[PDB]
Amino acid sequence: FDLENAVLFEVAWEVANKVGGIYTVLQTKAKVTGDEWGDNYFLVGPYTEQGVRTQVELLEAPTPALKRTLDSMNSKGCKVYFGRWLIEGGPLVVLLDVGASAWALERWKGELWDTCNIGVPWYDREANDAVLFGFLTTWFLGEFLAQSEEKPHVVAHFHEWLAGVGLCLCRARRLPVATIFTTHATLLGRYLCAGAVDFYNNLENFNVDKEAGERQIYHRYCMERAAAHCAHVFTTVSQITAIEAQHLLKRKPDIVTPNGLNVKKFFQNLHAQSKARIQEFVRGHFYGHLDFNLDKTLYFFIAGRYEFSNKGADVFLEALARLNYLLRVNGSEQTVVAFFIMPARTNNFNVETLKGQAVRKQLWDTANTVKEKFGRKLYESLLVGSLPDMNKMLDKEDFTMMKRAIFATQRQSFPPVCTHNMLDDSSDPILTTIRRIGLFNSSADRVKVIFHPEFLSSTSPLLPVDYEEFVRGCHLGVFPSYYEPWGYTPAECTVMGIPSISTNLSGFGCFMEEHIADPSAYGIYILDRRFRSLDDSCSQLTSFLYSFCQQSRRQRIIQRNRTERLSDLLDWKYLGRYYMSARHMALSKAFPEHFTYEPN
Amino acid sequence: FDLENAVLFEVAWEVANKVGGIYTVLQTKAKVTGDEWGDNYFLVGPYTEQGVRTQVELLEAPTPALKRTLDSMNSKGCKVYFGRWLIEGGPLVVLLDVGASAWALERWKGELWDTCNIGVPWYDREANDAVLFGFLTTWFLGEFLAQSEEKPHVVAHFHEWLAGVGLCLCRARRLPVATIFTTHATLLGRYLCAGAVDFYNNLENFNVDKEAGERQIYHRYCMERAAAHCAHVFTTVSQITAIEAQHLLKRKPDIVTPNGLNVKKFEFQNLHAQSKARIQEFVRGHFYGHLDFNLDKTLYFFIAGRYEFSNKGADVFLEALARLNYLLRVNGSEQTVVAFFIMPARTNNFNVETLKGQAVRKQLWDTANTVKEKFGRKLYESLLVGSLPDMNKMLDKEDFTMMKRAIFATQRQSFPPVCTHNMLDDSSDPILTTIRRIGLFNSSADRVKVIFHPEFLSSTSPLLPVDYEEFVRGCHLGVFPSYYEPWGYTPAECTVMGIPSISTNLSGFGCFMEEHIADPSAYGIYILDRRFRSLDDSCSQLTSFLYSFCQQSRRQRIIQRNRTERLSDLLDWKYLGRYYMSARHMALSKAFPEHFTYEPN
């Protein structure tokens, strides 16, 4: 438990190069781990030109023992650059370069085969990069111990299959370092889901070796599984990921370690301002098809990468069609606008969408011109001491201005379902379903779907809000997800006031079920897809969506306020306490004599 | 439960004129009663020139029968007006003038003596005005019934003592209109509380006639009691008022009809924070140089309403604050309590010290912004070149001097004043005397700081230009340890806003909450049992409540606030509309039951 001399190396591929969500995990965790482990915190990561230029300030190797190791490695010709990552908490980052390719071509790869009976194929560059990185990381910590008299036992925390090669070698060279091995995702899991018909139910009845071999990911799988077996403490991001590991990597996670977000701030009501901005987009997009009260309108959104099956857009869409039917048959004044935002390939803003925003501008401009003129005439009339003469306030010019405006706000075509024009409209799974389900945003429809393919940005003319502000504006965030190991997008939404309908297959969903008895009051509805069929799950989502819709204004307010209590559940302080347990268990397993403080 | 031909006539002195809280009730009752009685909803009230122009749009009679009535009334030397009140629900209002007192002396007054054996002194304006109003209302409704086809059901709702002369006459003239009389407060009760040592416990003991006579208020009392006896159905605002009515008027209320408010007051959690910031700015200004207190940990407690030391139990609050100060001192707390007594008094303009303190806060803020802006520009320029900010040299000599003047202006000097406005009588002010005695003098050591603002907070005022509603939203807690409050308009507003509010068994709102909520504390409305406890024990009870609130966790307090926002529905007219509808139905049943009879709810 105590770490008198222990030094933690959070070896990771995403130390100074943003490649995936793991980078956010490391960056956010850096602050809290920083406090606990002081200057013993040393993230090891691949050196990137971009990384050093914008993220890393190079530093003069302040531990003298470390300085010697850095120099020795540089003298041997391998390139290592010590520096301070400029992210919050100022973590010391030992960025080794993956440009030491000569050794890898024979020497590094050769050692691996004799040591672990494994190999990296010639074709795969990423694995080859990882073997280089792994050998260098093992060398660094081994050299660190050797060139530091009164050797401090270290706790290496390899965070992925890419860093996994190192863990195999550390144990194999029998170096006296405690080893954790978080799997932030299951390697085989991503390929098996979608690739196979029923991944999660057949999890138990999956031959890992067979699947990996078939997909030519066998080498990668072997490396990840070998790391699993090697690690003194094996941890996973979520309970769902744990189930994947148990039936694939064949090692039960010792601790269940959830990823977190630095909650921080995330005087002004973001919800109101953001809803206004969203409302203005809606007004513009509908271009005089505004037959529906926007006071009663609800906005639902699904974000994240454009994976139709994995991020479960299908469940949201099929469910929206069913919600449309329910709202129509019951004649509900409430209208749902479902703003799928999903980074996709688009040529430009669609003609209608751009024109729609322009007409909203024209109507607003006409309003301002007439309003100012009314302002002057009213002020003049009030000064005289007479109440305004209605029907005399507006001049003939003002009628021509407004008549042009009313002429502008006329359309016969139903308002567009996709704000950016698609490179391939037929191909888009979201758009194909929007057609099939029967959502063309007709006047009659109570559910209108607005698919915004571009990642939302402040610069864009339509919906000027940044992703943060758009999330804050929306009433509900529907994120049903088949494979999500940890729901980064759902987690962000929950940390923001927004109630979010996540799933039992999502890491965030599993986390919420475990930590909240009564989810629905607290906003985090958990659609179950692990014990259900696809259609029954859709019906379950429809029920959830309908329940949210059929809520009083007051009830919704309560729900949001409840969700703001659940920020603490997903704060790094508490989730780092989960990681601290992993480290303490690792320290105890590796050196029982040195440290034996592992109660529960 | 169908009123086929019934016509509702809510007669009150505050129908268009804002004399008192009754006016808010009617203005707010009008919308809901509007729906139940449709266009048969008529408000009978005094004509006020200023009132009529701002609030009322003059109209023509909807009914030919009504037109006849209006014309007849206009003919015989009376200047009745008819119009649509522009308040929610757009009710038709018959605003009769009490300036048309052509024959009131020795003819109307004369008649009243023969009918009700009651007389009104020449000196009293309010009673004299009420006889004019009462006689005119009785005439109007009697004439209406006679000139129109006879409606067996017309329901006249008298909503105060001075409208009660009409009820006395109506029943006496044997007119068939059903009469409901509602006492929003007991006249004798107000005088007896404070005026007597122990009004509440000796309720039964008091010979009402003797006490009323002694206070030269006997005529007013007789009118109130007469109206109560006269009404077929008698209503009272609260259960506590009912207990008073039972002993003082010697009549049990048939039904108890609680007053209600609108739900239109309001994530929407910005307001507690925005308002707290505005409040926090004032505190910084006022306490300049003694700002060792943590200003995030500080809690603001407030007592508002009219100025009544005994009635609003400001003494209990002050004594309890002194005990809280002792508790906070003895057990070290980062939290500091700032108590705002926003009770109106006659005072001069803002005290020199208070105004100067606010000015110094303004200067410091202005200096900070200017230096901040200059840092902003120099940092932005330095970053653009591609160089480190060089913080040491970023601030110029010119700003260093401006800041030096600023730090000099914020000199600690004397302890910050207790009262924002210098009082006309500081020496004798019931609050200030107590503050001095209790020992709260805003000393550096004290954990409890009392700021008494003797003017109703308003936008126009230079210092804290915050509207009462916004100030209320900003404060953490509202303490209203009322002794006599018949209905707590002030505590009610606070709860609808979501501010947790101390109320008492003696306050009508307090009694109402106890009856309707199984645990007061859990929902954030604390009840002090002042009826069944001694004064000192009650103070100790308040100290316990205040201390508990202080020792609440930040998260716990947030929960408490959110819980209060649920209690708004208890005070909403939607729910409270039931109670009056019951009263009206009961009126129809009590007399002439044959046409309409309804069994009790």
DSSP for A30-77 reads: HHHHHHHHGGGBEEEEE--HHHHHHTEEE----SHHHHHHHHHHHHTT
A557 Cβ under 8 Å from any chain B Cβ? yes
Binding residues of B for UDP: 18, 306, 490
Element (H, E) at A242: helix A239-248
Residue B231 and residue B234: Cα distance in Å, rounded?
Answer: 6
Residue among A53, A86, A561, A567 with most chain B CBs within 10 A, to mutate? A561
Q: A509 with A503: CB under 8 angstroms?
A: yes
Tokens of A56: 């890393």
Residues 6+ apart with CB under 8 A from A484: A310, A311, A490, A503, A505, A506, A507, A508
> Do B267 and A557 lie within an 8 Å CB cutoff?
yes
Contacts of A110 (CB under 8 A, 6+ apart): none
- From chain B, the residues in CB contact with A267 under 8 A are 270, 273-274, 277
Return the DSSP state at B279.
Answer: H
CB atoms within 10 A of CB A72: 17
CB-nearest to A560 from B267, B274, B277 is B267
Listing DSSP states for A530-590 in one string gives SSS-HHHHHHHHHHHHHHHHTS-HHHHHHHHHHHTTTTGGGBHHHHHHHHHHHHHHHHHHH
Distance from CA of B409 to the nearest CA of A (A): 29
Residue of chain B whose Cα is closest to the Cα of A563:
B267
- The residues, ordered by sequence, that sit 6+ positions from A292 with a Cβ below 8 Å of its Cβ are A335, A446
- Residue A184 is assigned to a ligand binding site: yes
**Residue linked to tokens 């490649």:** A19
Sheet containing strand A177-180, edge to edge, reads: A7-9, A154-157, A177-180
Q: What's CA A88's distance to the chain center, in Å? A: 19
**Domain containing residue B82: CATH number:** 3.40.50.2000
From the CA of B268, how many Å to the nearest CA of chain A?
A: 7
Q: What is the distance of C-alpha A583 from the center of its chain? A: 25
Distance from CA of A3 to the nearest CA of B (A): 33
Q: How far, in Å, CA of A141 to CA of A66, rounded?
A: 10
Q: B591 CB contacts (<8 Å, ≥6 apart)?
A: B176, B178, B232
Planar angle of CA B17, B21, B25, nearest 5 degrees: 85
Asked whether the beta carbons of residue B562 and residue A560 sit closer than 8 angstroms, the reply is: no
Give B-chain residues touching A271 at CB under 8 angstroms.
267
According to the annotation, is A305 in a ligand binding site? yes
Size of chain A, expressed as the number of residues it contains: 600
State the Cα–Cα distance between residues A42 and A420, nearest whole angstrom: 44
If you measure CA to CA, which chain A residue comes closest to B268?
A269
- Chain A residues close to B267, C-beta within 8 Å: 269-272, 497, 557, 560-561
Q: Minimal Cα distance from A566: which residue of B?
A: B555
Is A497 in the B-facing interface, judged by CB distances under 8 Å? yes
Of B270, B555, B565, nearest to A269 by CB-CB distance is B270
Range of A84's domain?
7-262+573-590
Half-sphere exposure of A228 (CA within 13 A, CB side): 25
For residues B133 and B227, the answer to whether their CB atoms sit within 8 Å is: no
* A246 assigned binding-site residue: no
Q: Which residues of B touch A497 (CB under 8 A)?
A: 267
A392 annotated ligand-binding residue: no
Cβ contact B269–A561 (<8 Å):
yes
CA A39 to each of CA A4, A63, A95, A563, B491: distance values in angstroms, whole numbers, following the listed order: 12, 9, 16, 36, 55
Do β-strands B92-96 and B41-46 pair in parallel, antiparallel, or remain unpaired? parallel
Q: What are the chain B neighbours of A475 within 8 Å (beta carbons)?
A: none
3-state secondary structure of A81: strand
Burial of residue B461 (CB within 10 Å: 0-12, 13-18, 19+) is middle
Report the Cα–Cα distance between both ends of chain B, in Å, rounded.
Answer: 11
Looking at the complex, does the CB of residue B273 fall below 8 Å from at least one CB of chain A?
yes
State which residue of chain B sits closest to A274, comparing Cα positions. B267
Type of residue at B545: F
> Residue B280 to residues A278, B339, B362: CA-CA distances in angstroms?
33, 13, 13
B553 touches chain A (CB under 8 A): no
B194, amino acid identity:
A
Query: How far apart, in whole angstroms, are the C-alpha atoms of residue B506 and residue B484?
Result: 6
For residue A269, which residues of chain B lie inside 8 Å, CB to CB?
A: 267-270
Q: In a 10 Å sphere around its CB, with 0-12 CB exposed, 13-18 middle and 19+ buried, how is residue B72 labelled? A: middle
DSSP 8-state class, residue B310: T
Among A554, A555, A563, most B C-beta atoms within 10 A, so best to mutate, is A554
User: How close A180 comes to chain B (CA, Å)?
Assistant: 35
A462–chain B nearest CA distance, Å: 25
CB contact under 8 A, A267 and B269: no
Whether B277 has its CB under 8 Å from any CB of chain A: the answer is: yes
Residues 6+ positions from A295 with CB-CB distance below 8 Å: none
CB B177 within 8 A of CB B145: yes
CB A83: neighbour CB atoms within 10 A? 21
Q: Is B267 on the interface with A (CB under 8 A)?
A: yes
> Do the beta carbons of residue B547 and residue B325 sit within 8 Å?
no
By the CB < 8 Å criterion, does B296 face chain A?
A: no
SS3 content of chain A, % helix, strand, coil (to 5): 50, 10, 40
CA distance A361 to chain B (A): 28
Rg (CA), chain B: 28
- Annotated binding residues of B for UDP-alpha-D-glucose, as ranges? 184, 190, 306, 485, 487-488
Chain B: closest CA distance from residue A558 (Å): 8
- Chain A CB contacts of B277 under 8 Å are 267
Q: Which residue of B has its CA nearest to A567?
A: B555
> Which residues on chain A are in Cβ contact (under 8 Å) with B273?
267
A558 interfacial to chain B (CB closer than 8 Å): yes
Within 8 A by CB and 6+ apart from A368, the residues are: none
Residue A270: closest C-alpha in chain B: B267
Cα–Cα distances (Å) from A574 to A260, A567, A577, in that order, read 9, 11, 5
Q: Does A268 contact chain B (CB < 8 Å)?
A: yes
Distance from CA of B139 to the nearest CA of A (A): 36
Which of A268, A558, A565 is nearest residue B270 as measured by Cβ atoms?
Answer: A268
- Of B267, B277, B558, Cβ closest to residue A269: B267
* Residues in binding site of B for alpha-D-glucose 6-phosphate: 267, 269, 272, 276, 476, 557, 561
Comparing alpha-carbon positions, the chain A residue that sits nearest to B277 is A267
Mutation to test the B interface, candidates A268, A273, A557, A568, most B Cβ within 10 Å = A557
- The C-alpha of A444 sits at a distance from chain B's nearest C-alpha, in angstroms, of 30
- Check: CB of residue B464 under 8 Å from CB of residue B282: yes
Whether residues A557 and B274 touch (CB distance < 8 A) is answered with: no
Q: After which residues is chain A broken (C to N over 2.5 A)?
A: 266
